[PDB]
Design a protein around this ligand. Structure first.
Ligand SMILES: [Zn+2]
Ligand SMILES: [Zn+2]
Length: 72
């Protein structure tokens, strides 16, 4: 509501732009900051995954598997 504090988990600065901000993993990141951990692709608005408190784009998430079926 009225009270509350903002913040960008990525850089740290507050996230505000007249209706701007990417919420993921119970956190807030800037459209730019919010990106993959492998290819570091712009995930501002797309399908991604969550592994080890990280962000992996569908593409990567699928690529990582190739590595090996064992251990998930
Ligand atoms: Zn940021
Ligand atoms: Zn990726």
């Amino acid at each position: 509501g009225s009270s509350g504090s903002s913040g960008c988990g990525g850089c740290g600065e507050d996230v505000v732009g007249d209706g701007a901000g990417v919420v993921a993993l119970d956190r807030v990141f800037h459209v730019g900051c919010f990106v993959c951990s492998t290819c570091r692709a712009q995930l501002r608005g797309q399908h991604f995954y969550a592994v080890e408190r990280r962000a992996y784009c569908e593409g990567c998430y699928v690529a990582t598997l190739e590595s090996g079926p064992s251990s998930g």
